[PDB]
Ligand binder design. Structure first.
Ligand SMILES: [Cl-]
Ligand SMILES: [Cl-]
Ligand SMILES: [Cl-]
Ligand SMILES: [Cl-]
Ligand SMILES: [Cl-]
Ligand SMILES: [Cl-]
Ligand SMILES: [Cl-]
Ligand SMILES: [Cl-]
Ligand SMILES: [Cl-]
Ligand SMILES: [Cl-]
Ligand SMILES: [Cl-]
Ligand SMILES: [Cl-]
Ligand SMILES: [F-]
Ligand SMILES: [F-]
Ligand SMILES: [F-]
Ligand SMILES: [F-]
Ligand SMILES: [F-]
Ligand SMILES: [F-]
Ligand SMILES: [Mg+2]
Ligand SMILES: [Mg+2]
Ligand SMILES: [Mg+2]
Ligand SMILES: [Mg+2]
Ligand SMILES: [Mg+2]
Ligand SMILES: [Mg+2]
Ligand SMILES: [Mg+2]
Ligand SMILES: [Mg+2]
Ligand SMILES: [Mg+2]
Ligand SMILES: [Mg+2]
Ligand SMILES: [Mg+2]
Ligand SMILES: [Mg+2]
Ligand SMILES: [Mg+2]
Ligand SMILES: [Mg+2]
Ligand SMILES: [Mg+2]
Ligand SMILES: [Mg+2]
Ligand SMILES: [Mg+2]
Ligand SMILES: [Mg+2]
Ligand SMILES: [Mg+2]
Ligand SMILES: [Mg+2]
Ligand SMILES: [Mg+2]
Ligand SMILES: [Mg+2]
Ligand SMILES: [Mg+2]
Ligand SMILES: [Mg+2]
Ligand code: NA
Ligand code: NA
Ligand code: NA
Ligand code: NA
Ligand code: NA
Ligand code: NA
Ligand code: NA
Ligand code: NA
Ligand code: NA
Ligand code: NA
Ligand code: NA
Ligand code: NA
Lengths: 175, 175, 175, 175, 175, 175
């Protein structure tokens, strides 16, 4: 099952991300169901927005929104929902939503998958346009869903991302 | 596994549908294999037709064609094969095929996924064009497959759909 | 050429819309060039948004942004850029942008193309979700493009849409 | 303009086909407008069917339905609406519809474009499945459009196709 | 799980192939992970090439590259990654790569799925273009990945393919 | 017509490129016909390769292969065949093919369309992977077409690209 995938080969620098939503896809918000491992439709998004990157989570982690910690993974081509990608964290967008605090990690494909992202070492190496698109997306994607809301609080660096990974891996572990 | 998804949160009004074939897709007829939970290609359809809605089944049900009961789910965008959608039954197309009687339920995305279909309470609220397309599809999609055939017998309302769900949930339960 | 297509068979109730951008497409903002009739890339949109409907213009009209008046056309399936669709106006989103006032008409496929939209007679017959998505789109799609901006000013009815069509058809005519 | 493309390099064996509808596409029935050369939406098809091959016409020809003669062109990948393909006729499906008699030619990509279809010399060399799909399509695609109808009358060989081409090229020529 | 799918209904003539990569897809090289059954991104291919056919493996087999034996499956439409197709072997491209010897079987959809490939009995019945495309693909797809390499050694017939299947099914069985 | 588009707003630094083939598309080699302006299928490519970037030409130029000079344009999303993009030359891949010498320019979207490529000033600023993919593509895409061949001769800088543009604009001008 997708429930039995590790958090990573060597957390926090070498992680696996389970993809739920491909980059640039139709506005279907899929989420993996914890007990079955199946991809469920969480909702049909109301705004005419798309995720700027592939979107998923790190297995065996727990955030403060009651879900595994969330990751954006830029790739040259969109990934399949339910697939798993080896990546390296490079930054994090801090934010809270209606279900609790809910950081959005950015992790790039691992060097072994591709050399394309090897030059992205830290958050300042991400394209400004991409970071700005990601922030705008999270600021606005819930604008038409009553009872769903966001506070975006800014970008933090790879060490912050890594600290989040470690802390979420510790959370699910005695939870 | 997709074999461990419930029939629904509160059958028959609140169901889960496992999707096998997206709306408006290529003519590959996928079916979930009961023992592995995998998506198998059942066949390459011979007619140049597509399913008017996403197509799948309710887990832990049994129809008279030896398969779980079949459901059509209209959505704004096609769903992924193998994904699961929470829905609400609104009508049923009665029909029989070569493998035995084989009703085609229509269920719309649950209000929690989207408000888009909340106005569809019963079968008369479905668009006439959509119902007519669905009936035509089932009347003709097997026209070029020898030994596969259909008798479409007309549309019935949400209570009939719900009765079918309950009865199929009872069938698999002592089968 | 696409420059020689009429404004419509019987303006303002029966119009032709030249499509520039399909619904639910990649964020490439195409515009027809007036002198060549070719589809040019105006820009690569910076926000992660898509047009909720097909988007184009009525030929031989002139708005206050120096362009033909702009139209959104809902369809069951996205249209090809450069194609032309016969439609019927049903409402208008009033708004201004950096290039001047710039109304966004909504027109549905003509009955002769499809009966699907015949029940949409006026702006109140459009789905609330669709109208809300359209307004949100225009409110936010320029949020990351410096020097591009929007003031959305609300929805008006089919007669207002029709008055706009007539007035823009008169503008280009002694311009 | 697409109005100025020849009927072919050497009719009837070497023709050009202007494509209006790609194979396996969404059910949007495009038609080139004779006076503008633009692709217009003729209608949104009501049945859940797709064209088994790319579909278009031979320029500077005239059929008995008031339109240029119609051609199906099988290709390995769907063609773009408005593109032009060099082909070789191999057979014809005879049929009439509401607008008058309306043969459906089949022509394969010319050897110069690809060697893939060089083995298809005549109608008996077309796959049986493809011919059967084409006939079924034309038998049924108008089943839900009132006032549109078809009589399919069977397959004829490459010489018959070629005779049709010549005769339609003569028709438009003193018409 | 995809790990519990059989090698086939009646090996070697009747096999199941688990698909990892669809025909004509984006250059994402997916591989099923043996212990989780999940689809992992193995790498982002560096060359601008696509697989000429759907690509996957026979479960419960073991090749000399440490992986299940690899199969190409031509279909009329691309298959979903993670789906399973019943097929019949018709030939094999012999080759070695950096991970060891690594034959590429070709197997066509079983007659029960479609009659389309029933005329392909042996390797000489495959289109020359398709075989040539497959060989060229394997000759060149690793050209830009350092440390990945190929020696293509030519085509062999259905009996050779079948012998490979049997031998790989025996290998994993006491391994 | 696409024949009446300028070479550029201010050649050679500010050019327009007419797109014939989108990036990452199916292997249909379209070419604009000079006398009609229509997109014709030149051929169905035999290798399983795709263009790494959008591909087209500069109007009103003439190369030594008897065609307008050829340009690759990287974009975030593939462009429509027949569309026109404003760009800035940054480098050139020198090469000859069977029809004569045939340089492949690389030009990035103009700053006015997007700021994404503003950091690419010269050929050394292009990603190494992209340049390597482009060279490999041209080295191999004709490998299965008899009588079509290539000699790739290496990368040259933006000034070389610009000199090519100027010289081709002069060639068509007294030709
Ligand atoms: Cl773990
Ligand atoms: Cl930002
Ligand atoms: Cl249950
Ligand atoms: Cl009906
Ligand atoms: Cl007019
Ligand atoms: Cl609104
Ligand atoms: Cl002619
Ligand atoms: Cl037939
Ligand atoms: Cl087995
Ligand atoms: Cl070969
Ligand atoms: Cl010029
Ligand atoms: Cl290079
Ligand atoms: F989450
Ligand atoms: F079933
Ligand atoms: F405009
Ligand atoms: F016609
Ligand atoms: F392998
Ligand atoms: F060229
Ligand atoms: Mg959630
Ligand atoms: Mg999450
Ligand atoms: Mg959240
Ligand atoms: Mg979350
Ligand atoms: Mg079945
Ligand atoms: Mg079923
Ligand atoms: Mg059935
Ligand atoms: Mg059934
Ligand atoms: Mg503009
Ligand atoms: Mg406009
Ligand atoms: Mg504007
Ligand atoms: Mg405007
Ligand atoms: Mg017609
Ligand atoms: Mg016609
Ligand atoms: Mg007709
Ligand atoms: Mg006709
Ligand atoms: Mg491998
Ligand atoms: Mg393998
Ligand atoms: Mg290998
Ligand atoms: Mg292998
Ligand atoms: Mg050429
Ligand atoms: Mg060229
Ligand atoms: Mg060339
Ligand atoms: Mg050239
Ligand atoms: Na998309
Ligand atoms: Na909200
Ligand atoms: Na489709
Ligand atoms: Na049948
Ligand atoms: Na899209
Ligand atoms: Na702005
Ligand atoms: Na399609
Ligand atoms: Na009819
Ligand atoms: Na593809
Ligand atoms: Na290599
Ligand atoms: Na593609
Ligand atoms: Na060659």
């Amino acid at each position: 099952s997708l429930l039995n995938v590790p958090a990573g080969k060597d957390l926090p620098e070498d992680i696996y991300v389970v993809i739920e939503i491909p980059a640039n896809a139709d506005p279907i918000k899929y989420e993996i169901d914890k007990e079955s491992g199946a991809l469920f439709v969480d909702r049909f998004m109301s705004t005419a927005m798309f995720y700027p990157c592939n979107y998923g989570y790190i297995n065996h982690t727990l955030s403060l929104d009651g879900d595994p910690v969330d990751v954006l993974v830029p790739t040259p081509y969109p990934l399949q929902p339910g697939s798993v990608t080896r990546c390296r964290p490079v930054g994090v967008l801090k934010m809270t939503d209606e279900a609790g605090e809910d950081a959005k990690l950015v992790a790039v494909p691992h060097s072994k998958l591709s050399k394309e992202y090897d030059h992205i070492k830290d958050v300042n190496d991400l394209p400004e346009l991409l970071k700005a698109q990601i922030a705008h997306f999270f600021e606005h994607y819930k604008d038409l869903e009553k009872g769903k809301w966001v506070k975006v609080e800014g970008w933090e660096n790879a060490e912050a991302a890594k600290a989040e990974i470690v802390a979420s891996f510790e959370r699910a572990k005695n939870k």
